[PDB]
Design a protein around this ligand. Structure first.
Ligand SMILES: N[C@H]1[C@@H](O[C@H]2[C@H](O)[C@@H](O)[C@H](N)C[C@@H]2N)O[C@H](CO)[C@@H](O)[C@@H]1O
Ligand SMILES: C[C@H]1O[C@@H](n2cnc3c(N)ncnc32)[C@H](O)[C@@H]1O
Ligand code: MET
Ligand code: SF4
Length: 453
C-alpha cells in the first residue's frame, strides 16, 4: 500500500558542511566541506520501499531545495543527525503539522535523544540502520521488526544488539532517484559521484571512542561481491563519475577483497572508486589489487604521531614505522592516501599533540592527504560516559562537530584543546604554503608544547 513517500535530508544552519554520513552516521561538520556525498541511506530506503509504494522521492534540501509542503496523509522520513538533532526535530514537527505520518531515520543510539524526537518531532517511530532491510514491515505497522523504535518500548535491549537482516536480498539503492551532479569527491571527481557500501560494522576495540561500531554493530556484515559489481554497473549506466565506499574496514576480509577486485576488473565498468580501511588490513598485494581494480585512494587511520599514544590510547597496536612503510608502499604503487588523525584522546599531552604534527610534517603530507579530528564524545561510546562521570564535556552537542574542541581530558584543558583545534587550521594553511611557513609553524608548536602555561 504505503501511498506517497518522501525521504528528506533536511536543511540545517550548517549547510552542506554538515555531512550526515560521517562519524558513524551521526554527522560531521567541517568548514568549507568539499567532500559532499549523496544521501545514500535515504536511497537504500527508497530501494527497499519502492516495490510497495505508489510514489516515492528523495529530497536533499541543501541541494534540491526545501520541500514547500506535503499533502496530509503521506509518509515523510527525515534524516536526523547529532549536531543538528534540534533542527531536524523542528523540521519533523513541521511535516507533522501538515498531516504527514512522520518518521525519523538516525544512527543515534541514545534513548535520551529519541525522547526529543518523539516529543518535539512527533514521530510515529524512529528508524535505525537495522530497519532498512525491513523498512516495508515497519510502515505496515509491525513493531517486532528490528531497527524500529516506538515511543512505547523505547528501551528494548534489541536496539543495542543490532539485528541485521538478509543483506544479500536487499534491492539496489535508488541511485536513479537522485541527480548526482551536485555531489563532489575532490580526489576523484568534482561532479556526479556516489557513495556505496560493501560491508558494515567493525569489531575493533577502538570502539572505545569511534562511533562506527556503535552505529553499525561490532560484527562485519558483507554484501555479496556480485551485488557490489551490480552496483558498479548501475553507476556506469546512470553516468556516475565515482563510487566512494563507506565501509569502516573495507579490506577486513583479505581474500574477499582480492576477489572483489578481480570481479570489479572483469566487469570493466570504468567507474573509479575510493575506500576506507585499516593499515593493518593492507599489504603490497592488496594495494596492487586495489590500484589495478580502479581504486584511486584510501583513507586510513593513524590517529596519533606519538609512539606512546599508539601503545595505549589509540587501541590499534599500530606502529609508527608500519605507518611509514605503508606510506612508502602506497606512494610507490600510485595509490592516493589520506591519513586520519585524532587529537585529544585521554592520556594525550601537549608533547603528544606536537609529535602528531611532527609526524605529519615528517611524512611530508600535502594538504589533501591528511585530516585531523578533535575528540568528540559520541553518546553511546564508553568515552562519552567516562567524560560525563568526570565533568569533561564543556561544549554543547550542537557543536559536536568532529572538528570543535568540546571536551577536555584529565591531562588537557579546553584551552589547550581549543588551541590545538586552531593549530589544525594553521597546519592546513601552512601545508598549502612553502617551507618557510612550515618551519615557523613547527617553531610555534615546539614553543607551545614546552612552556606549559
Ligand atoms: N572518512 C572519515 C573522514 O572523513 C572526513 C574526510 O577525511 C575529510 O577529508 C572531509 N573534508 C571531512 C570528512 N568528514 O574523517 C572523519 C572524522 O573526521 C570520519 O568520521 C570519516 O569516516
Ligand atoms: C573513523 C575515523 O574517525 C576518527 N574518529 C574516531 N572516533 C572519533 C571521535 N570519537 N571523535 C573524533 N574523531 C573520531 C578516527 O580517526 C577514525 O579513523
Ligand atoms: C579508518 C579505519 N577504520 C581505521 O581505524 O584505521
Ligand atoms: S577500526 Fe576504524 S572504524 Fe573501527 S572502531 Fe577502530 S577507528 Fe573506528
Amino acid at each position: 500500500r504505503l501511498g506517497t513517500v518522501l525521504l528528506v535530508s533536511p536543511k540545517t544552519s550548517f549547510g552542506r558542511d554538515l555531512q550526515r554520513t560521517y562519524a558513524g552516521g551521526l554527522g560531521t561538520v567541517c568548514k568549507d566541506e568539499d567532500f559532499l556525498l549523496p544521501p545514500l541511506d535515504l536511497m537504500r530506503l527508497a530501494g527497499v520501499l519502492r516495490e510497495d509504494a505508489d510514489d516515492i522521492a528523495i529530497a536533499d534540501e541543501e541541494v534540491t531545495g526545501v520541500v514547500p509542503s506535503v499533502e496530509p496523509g503521506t509518509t515523510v522520513i527525515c534524516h536526523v543527525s547529532l549536531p543538528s538533532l534540534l533542527e531536524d526535530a523542528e523540521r519533523l514537527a513541521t511535516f507533522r503539522a501538515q498531516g504527514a505520518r512522520c518518521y525519523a531515520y538516525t544512527s543515534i543510539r541514545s534513548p535520551a535523544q529519541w525522547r526529543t524526537l518523539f516529543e518535539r518531532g512527533g514521530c510515529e517511530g524512529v528508524l535505525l540502520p537495522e530497519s532498512i532491510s525491513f523498512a516495508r514491515a515497519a510502515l505496515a505497522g509491525d513493531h517486532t521488526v528490528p531497527g524500529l523504535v516506538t515511543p512505547d518500548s523505547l528501551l528494548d535491549p534489541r536496539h543495542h544488539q543490532p539485528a541485521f537482516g538478509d543483506l544479500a536480498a536487499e534491492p539496489l539503492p535508488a541511485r536513479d532517484l537522485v541527480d548526482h551532479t551536485p555531489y563532489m569527491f575532490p580526489p576523484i571527481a568534482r561532479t556526479g559521484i556516489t557513495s556505496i557500501n560493501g560491508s558494515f560494522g567493525c569489531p575493533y576495540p577502538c570502539r572505545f571512542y569511534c562511533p562506527y561500531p556503535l552505529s553499525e554493530g561490532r560484527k562485519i556484515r558483507t554484501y555479496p561481491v556480485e551485488r557490489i559489481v551490480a552496483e558498479f554497473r548501475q553507476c556506469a549506466e546512470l553516468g556516475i563519475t565515482a563510487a566512494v565506499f563507506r565501509d569502516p574496514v573495507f579490506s577486513f576480509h583479505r581474500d574477499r577483497t582480492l576477489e572483489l577486485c578481480q570481479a570489479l576488473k572483469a566487469a570493466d565498468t570504468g567507474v573509479p572508486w575510493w575506500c576506507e580501511t585499516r593499515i593493518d588490513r593492507l599489504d603490497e598485494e592488496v594495494v596492487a589489487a586495489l590500484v589495478d581494480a580502479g581504486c584511486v585512494g584510501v583513507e586510513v587511520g593513524v590517529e596519533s604521531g606519538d609512539p606512546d599514544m599508539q601503545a595505549t590510547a589509540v587501541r590499534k597496536r599500530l606502529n609508527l614505522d608500519t605507518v611509514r612503510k605503508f606510506h612508502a608502499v602506497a606512494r610507490k604503487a600510485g595509490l592516493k592516501l589520506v591519513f586520519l588523525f585524532l587529537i585529544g584522546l585521554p592520556r594525550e599531552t601537549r608533547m603528544s599533540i606536537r609529535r602528531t604534527f611532527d609526524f605529519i610534517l615528517e611524512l611530508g603530507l600535502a594538504d589533501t592527504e591528511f585530516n585531523l579530528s578533535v575528540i568528540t564524545p559520541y553518546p553511546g561510546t564508553e568515552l562519552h560516559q567516562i567524560a560525563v562521570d568526570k565533568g569533561w564535556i564543556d561544549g554543547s552537542q550542537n557543536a559536536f562537530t568532529s572538528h570543535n574542541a568540546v571536551m577536555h581530558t584529565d591531562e588537557l584543558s579546553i584551552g589547550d584543546l581549543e588551541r590545538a583545534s586552531r593549530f589544525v587550521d594553521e597546519l592546513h594553511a601552512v601545508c598549502k604554503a612553502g617551507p618557510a611557513e612550515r618551519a615557523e609553524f613547527q617553531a610555534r608548536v615546539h614553543a607551545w608544547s614546552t612552556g606549559d602555561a
